[PDB]
Every structure is written in C-alpha cells, then in structure tokens.
Amino acid sequence: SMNPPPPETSNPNKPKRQTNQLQYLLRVVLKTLWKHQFAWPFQQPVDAVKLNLPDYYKIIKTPMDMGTIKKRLENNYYWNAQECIQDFNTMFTNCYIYNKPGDDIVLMAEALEKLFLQKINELPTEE
Ligand SMILES: Cc1cc(C)cc(Nc2nccc(-c3c(-c4ccc(F)cc4)ncn3C3CCNCC3)n2)c1
C-alpha cells in the first residue's frame, strides 16, 4: 500500500528554544545511535512500498524514525527533551508491535534501545 507522508519536522507556528538537554539529544544521543552497526533500518521512514509490507501502516499509526528525529532536533521542533525521548520510544515500540520477538529487526532495535537508555541515563541536568 502507499506510504504516508513522513512526520512533520518543521512548524513555523511552534515556539522554539535551545536547551542543554536538546543539544545533548542531538550531538550525543542521535549521533551515537546513528553510527551504530544496526542503525540503518531506523535512519528513515519505513518504506513499506519498497519492502512490500502492505499492512505496515494499517498497524502502525504513529510512525517514527531517526531521520525524522534528526530533523526535528535541527529545526528546534521540540520545546522539551521529553518530546524527543517520546519519539525514540515510539520508534522502538512500533518495531516491537509489528514484528515477532526474536526476529532480526527486533534484536537490532533492542540493541539500539539499550544504547539509547544508557545515553539518556546521562542526560545532563537542565541548565
Ligand atoms: C530483508 C530485510 C531484513 C531486515 C531484518 C531488515 C530489512 N530492512 C528494513 N528496512 C526498514 C524497515 C524494516 C523493518 C521494520 C522496521 C520497523 C520499525 C522501525 F522503526 C524500523 C524498522 N520492521 C520490519 N522490517 C522488515 C520487514 C521485511 N522483513 C524484514 C524486516 N526493515 C530488510
């Protein structure tokens, strides 16, 4: 089935700010996860057309990915760190919902999620 448009990444009507926590989420968390050997399926929206997954967006109605998260952080789309953390969590949960436990893609997500959690544990205090 057709892909949906990717998630919104810029909103001129949405107020903006820079915080040490958002800067960390971009320069440490996103960067580190991006470079991980298992990152590639998570670096862009799931192309369900190319992958022949006609039911993907019947099941997943809140898609998310790290390509989108990168843009959101760049465009100061987020007011707070929790919005961004929520997007990462959504990204992983979608993968877990659509797939069978122990599947390759799930082991890949679990490793990335482990690393994510280790990094957010070291989220700096809001300065
Ligand atoms: C042949 C092959 C094998 C593997 C292991 C991966 C891929 N490529 C690829 N690219 C983007 C997505 C997925 C994917 C996802 C998925 C879901 C959510 C998310 F955030 C990230 C990924 N969930 C399932 N998949 C596929 C669907 C077809 N069967 C393999 C898993 N797979 C291609």
UniProtKB/Swiss-Prot annotation:
Phosphorylation by CK2 disrupt the intramolecular binding between the bromo domain 2 and the NPS region and promotes binding between the NPS and the BID regions, leading to activate the protein and promote binding to acetylated histones. In absence of phosphorylation, BRD4 does not localize to p53/TP53 target gene promoters, phosphorylation promoting recruitment to p53/TP53 target promoters. It is found in: Nucleus; Chromosome. Coiled coil: none annotated. Belongs to the BET family. It is linked to Cornelia de Lange syndrome 6: A form of Cornelia de Lange syndrome, a clinically heterogeneous developmental disorder associated with malformations affecting multiple systems. It is characterized by facial dysmorphisms, abnormal hands and feet, growth delay, cognitive retardation, hirsutism, gastroesophageal dysfunction and cardiac, ophthalmologic and genitourinary anomalies. CDLS6 inheritance is autosomal dominant. The NET domain mediates interaction with a number of chromatin proteins involved in transcription regulation (NSD3, JMJD6, CHD4, GLTSCR1 and ATAD5). The C-terminal (CTD) region mediates interaction and recruitment of CDK9 and CCNT1 subunits of the P-TEFb complex. It is also required for maintenance of higher-order chromatin structure. There is a cross-link at residue 58 (Glycyl lysine isopeptide (Lys-Gly) (interchain with G-Cter in SUMO2)). JQ1, a thieno-triazolo-1,4-diazepine derivative, and I-BET, a benzodiazepine derivative, have been tested on tumors with success. Treatment with GSK1210151A (I-BET151, a I-BET derivative) has strong effets on mixed lineage leukemia and promotes myeloid differentiation and leukemia stem-cell depletion. This is Bromodomain-containing protein 4. The chain holds residues 44 to 168 of 1362 of the full protein. Residues 17-123 form the Bromo domain. The record marks 99 as: Acetylated histone binding. Interacts with p53/TP53; the interaction is direct. Interacts (via CTD region) with CDK9 and CCNT1, acting as an associated component of P-TEFb complex. Interacts with RELA (when acetylated at 'Lys-310'). Interacts (via NET domain) with NSD3, CHD4, BICRA and ATAD5. The interaction with BICRA bridges BRD4 to the GBAF complex. Interacts (via NET domain) with JMJD6 (via JmjC and N-terminal domains); the interaction is stronger in presence of ssRNA and recruits JMJD6 on distal enhancers. Interacts with NSD3. Interacts with NIPBL. It comes from the Eukaryota. Changing residue 104 to G: Found in a patient with a neurodevelopmental syndrome; uncertain significance. Chromatin reader protein that recognizes and binds acetylated histones and plays a key role in transmission of epigenetic memory across cell divisions and transcription regulation. Remains associated with acetylated chromatin throughout the entire cell cycle and provides epigenetic memory for postmitotic G1 gene transcription by preserving acetylated chromatin status and maintaining high-order chromatin structure. During interphase, plays a key role in regulating the transcription of signal-inducible genes by associating with the P-TEFb complex and recruiting it to promoters. Ubiquitously expressed.
